[PDB]
Amino acid sequence: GKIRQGFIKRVARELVNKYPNEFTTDFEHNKKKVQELTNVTSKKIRNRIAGYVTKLVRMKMEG
């Protein structure tokens, strides 16, 4: 039951499109940036968005 939910896959794309330079491969850094940029109150969804943007930023430079 890994699959990242749809609305996370939707939020992350916009988040990294507006502030691409803001995010890096570090999970804690991008997590704090998700916390300060978004209004999520659930720690779990904050960290899930952090993980998905971590992977997304990782793919940004692979090709």
């Binding site: 939020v11 507006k18 978004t38 209004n39």
Partner: peptide, 8 residues
């Protein structure tokens, strides 16, 4: 709803 996140 908890699934509603807004960008800024």
């Amino acid at each position: 709803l908890p699934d509603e996140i807004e960008i800024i």
